């Protein structure tokens, strides 16, 4: 279930990255021209910077998750082979 | 008598030549009082698992048949005793007067030798008794990561049977068997002390196969405990058996099977590990009235790693038992204790394992909490939710508070009925979330001090009469005036 | 009555004996390697009876240079090590040979390194706090005097430094005897420990047994038993309070796996020996207090490839009273000791043993850190700005708490030049009560890093610009 | 004499019947000068791992004893030579007149045969020599992704020993062994060329098991280099051994184990791959004075995949060595070279083996950089200082610095003398300035080198010289860097 | 369409499309909240939550697990009810009204018991 | 090699696809009953690749230069086959659909492509 979970996380992170990127570009448009995606502004330009940061973080997260997923993929192949060959060796 | 000879030996396994008439799973005597069991029988030799101290086994030693399949002594003398998987005392308190002997592999009751599970086995834990109720004859898996409270649930269930024991009525009494498999000796000693303080050793037996035991003893301990329980079950008694835990028994069986060089399966487990657990757990049953009406309730424990219930042994055992209480580290650390994951914990007997009052108050509690958790996740970043959504969230937070319970703090079934009634019938809504617990604690105390007839009515009739409901509602409303909501 | 080598497969040797003279399991046999540079006397340990009067044995020394057909002599007993007050202050190898004084101890009483664990009826659960002065240990993972403590961690997260810390905090003012087992760890770490103990005047109360990385798997599997035999003698015969330090017990399991492979056994999961749990259980159940006879054991458990689900540490968990799980993620943040407060545990962290206040404060710390962990997915993308005011407040509190669980350690001075600190348990409880209640929310986060008690907190907050 | 015969042969393994008197791990000669090591000895045959051209092995071939456990020739004649893991020359320069032979699997010095690491092993790399100092007898892991500069660090360290060599004092000289395991032949040739141009082959031996070699040679190469080095170390010499890289050796050993049908574990590695690396690296030690005080410093190289230091082999080696220099691909591609990562890079035991002047100038440097990284992730003055420090730690390949020059450069960075200088010129600035101090005021370097300390008078003169240099330093931008 | 007919098939496909879109949006709703969705996507999310709840049903064999007797909904009522749900005709009812009921009469009764009206 | 060593020519050796060479080696290893290594590849993966690649070299003033199509399983560059291959690669040329669709030939992606001697 580790690989299934990692794939689900990768899908979620991809959707988030797409949304944040669209928000960043729309905030760029609205700069030339309530909500909480403005970063530390409460604590358009600020939303643009916050969405840039968020989409970059989503990209970093996708890369890390993909690395972990590929490690799990390789480990699963190796383990499955180990079980198959262990059984075959037992019978041989 | 027929004699074979050891031809090779190591790591708790031996191979014996001769013994032409040995049976499958026969007990074998090695020199020095060491016993073994014949697992592999082929033309050349018998592969035997040593149940004890194999370092004394040598090539050329004489091995004798016993003519007996694996069996253990059984009787009422095992109550209050700690034994090893052969039924031999290890508590240093002398011999145990056995009533008789039982073969470990006697078959489970058939479809027509049973009747439906219909008697509650109260744990004293609100979350379990209201949301995953356990009946007599049920197998309820307690599964979770290390230190999530699995042993605490099982030991508190054992301790909650003291009142039933004191009644003296064998149709009410529950005798308890605690099988410790692969546990460190001091942990078993601490469990025994906990049982002793609560007066549970009067009706409890501990079958112990600590981590220092041979893999054979660890493999056998669940079956030994099951046979001891079955002797009572078939004599019209009610038995609760705890296996703490079956993960280690599966590992011990895998060790034995690999040492015998049987071909491994998934995770190197033998092909029949599912069978190992299923044939054990199907012996827990609710017997029909023709066979005495006895029962044995099973509480197997499974330890998962990294909250991975998809591993081989957890999946097997989940697919065997009549429901599971899933304990989570994240819930535990949040303060949800017992750390039951309500969405995925289920009882497959359901309301049949509850008294009428509990069934009525706790009707849809589990689905309500499941939907509450779903909504909580969905409404995490919602601003200005619906009125209905806000009401659902408030009620669910109150219910979650209501189901929190400290260790060694059992509630009688009537107290649980009243506690649940508070939440599900809406009487906690005026109470702040953070005070919910306190409120319940003080309300029950109040009903205990006065209006104790509400508890008496629930206890004696198993249902909350309309007039008792009216009185309880009035008592709650009166108590709320004097309650200080911090 | 002598046997002869018939097979050699690395550190495992098959030996034939005349019928009737086959040695017993665990007997020590002796063979000779005569090749000049590698000349030595091999100690073999009988591991299996193969049949036809053949035994399979594990060599305690490398077998390089051994020849088929050479004579093998059965000593008639298992490997035994010298015991008594004389072993204190001296360094030994897994066979009981003194390394700092060769020949020393040959005249002492010798005990077989193989024995049964204490009878179940002699076992007594231990619930008594061993106060360390480390904030995180005392608060969240209180150690047990006479109990079993483990330090889990991946490669280089601070296990050995924490073992040295606990030697400093527990062994130095100890009144009883100490036994240190180096199992499959760095030889220079052993030399460093020897020198450090001599400097601190603790060596005279300590027996050091080393079988380190550059040893055959048999020595790495038996050295722990040798050290444990010395500890058992001190516990049972001398009626002494004993400390037992082991670094690293995972190396014992790993050596067992190597040996099992050589012995021809079918592998279990992840290539481990089928008897992994059983070997570990024998060893661990020997390491224990009995009624009136106390051993406090501290063991470092290596976690392969940072995989806490690996079968070796996973099996080790059940044998412990207190478990400090070091985390790579904590280590990466500069938090020393790199304790994972949510994964560590103590069997005595419950109100009955430590009291209501300690338990409540520990539980509130754990709740806050758990909530912070649950928010990490959201924070990793958006930061704290999207959180609700309650969650923002909790996150600030949790960051300060997780910093304040760090501590300048005594053994860390060699790395940072900063002397360590000791915090009384009462002060730790009070300080974390204030922290969870939000009384230090105004102080900057860095003020909570690598300090001791509240006085240090005030001084560092001042040095930064705030004021407590 | 005893003559065995090949009964079967496959995939670098052979089985030989006969040779009743063969020893475990003995070297066996197969026809055509092929060698094998007797791994498994039973009553039917000897399993042998072929070290060399396995394709020449045939059934029925005669096999002869060597009478020698697995061993290599050792002696001073190996300096400046390139050999294979058997000690046979491959540089085409004739025979190597060996002093003696040394068995490959001799045990490491015991806990009581060592002493604390206390003498620095200067790498000439400012980042390492300042932040992860290496003492003689220490094992420092060089770990990183492919093409992150690992070989460059190790080769620069070897090149840095030329000045020590020229003194002729065996207490100061460092003899170098460079083991190439599974490396492309062209890269070994380039390494040898760089060592020759730097005058380093005089005191360096190369053990080569290139990518085209069979697994037996790749598995053996580190032990051969270690034995060559140990011969010198036990004779009171100081040795530096580079294993480039141990990932490939682990792969070779895994191949050999699988071909022997040993059941694997994690990542299909044999259960004793940890032992493979740990017994190798345990033999790098700082000997006690009773044993001569010699030392062997190990620089194992590990290649990670995608910067994953939590994998099995990297964690094994991390748990063997006394610290690691983590080379980050992100830094390398940003032009930060050598691409050392401060957060993960640490010297466990080299803190003591650092001259006093370097300690004084670098103790702050460590903290400044560690905190500047987190700040830059997101004061302004500390940002400028951190940029200047990151610039200062950059270093061209093949140009190690003497410790006195490193002290002066770290002084410049740490004492704020670069706050005035443009970032883009810091490098050039430092270079020219150091050259100035060599041409004139060279007594500063002499004082530091003799005393190993930075004196108050020498520090004052250094500041004066820095100001005079700033007077006439032409920034690329054109602006003066004065004050 | 050839077997179940055009109405059944179209309603089924619309339900599936809505639930698929909701599953696509769940991660965004979890991280960034629902207010960041488009108004049309918010409409779809409300419809989808009601639809998924209305696919649940009180089954007879589940009485023992809920205390509630089961219900049976004719095919025609199912098709008409889900056609209405996909069109947004019940968006004014709380989502909890759709949980563990039978047909539209049960829906009206449960909504009344929760305050709203069908 | 004959062209380089006997005819004294410079040779361009194209290999499409080198991954299929690695995989054929894995299949042969399986057929011969060898225990698979990590991710199921032959235990001698690196040795086989080295034996092939180290013959592609410059020597005696003439060279064999190789352009090799590489398939990356699962797009995972840490997969043993692409990792072993890239241990020998000196440059990468990525042809981009985007660049081709602009009429730019050769359709080399100037940002994705790289070389180890551009220093
Ligand atoms: N309801 C509870 N409230 C508070 N603490 C509890 C509760 N239940 C259990 N605990 C504590 O949680 C810790 C773990 O409990 P327990 O030993 O029963 O768990 P486990 O899953 O069986 O553990 P192990 O992995 O050691 O076998 C113990 O300290 C116990 O006191
Ligand atoms: N308290 C501390 N303060 C500062 N640095 C520390 C501290 N603890 C550990 N370190 C750093 O971490 C390094 C590793 O510590 P330690 O040797 O205890 O790790 P380990 O877990 O035993 O490692 P291994 O798996 O390699 O044996 C130490 O050399 C030191 O650099
Ligand atoms: N200090 C440096 N300054 C500038 N360029 C450098 C430096 N070190 C290395 N390089 C460049 O980086 C290239 C790769 O470095 P190097 O070969 O040392 O890395 P590696 O990690 O050992 O590589 P591989 O994976 O090929 O073995 C070198 O060819 C050189 O071009
Ligand atoms: Mg438990
Ligand atoms: Mg360590
Ligand atoms: Mg390189």
Author numbering:
A (entry chain G): 3 to 35, 85 to 94, 256 to 304
B (entry chain C): 29 to 514
C (entry chain F): 8 to 475
D (entry chain B): 29 to 406, 417 to 521
E (entry chain D): 358 to 475
F (entry chain E): 239 to 357
Give the original sentences from the paper that presented this experimental model.
The membrane domain of the mycobacterial ATP synthase is embedded in the IPM, with the catalytic F1-domain of the enzyme extending into the bacterial cytoplasm and attached to the membrane domain by a central stalk and a peripheral stalk (PS).
Each nucleotide binding site in the three α-subunits and in subunit βTP is occupied by an ATP molecule with an accompanying Mg2+ ion, while the site in subunit βDP has ADP and an accompanying Mg2+ ion. In the untethered forms, these regions are disordered in the reconstructions and are presumably freely moving in the adjacent aqueous environment.
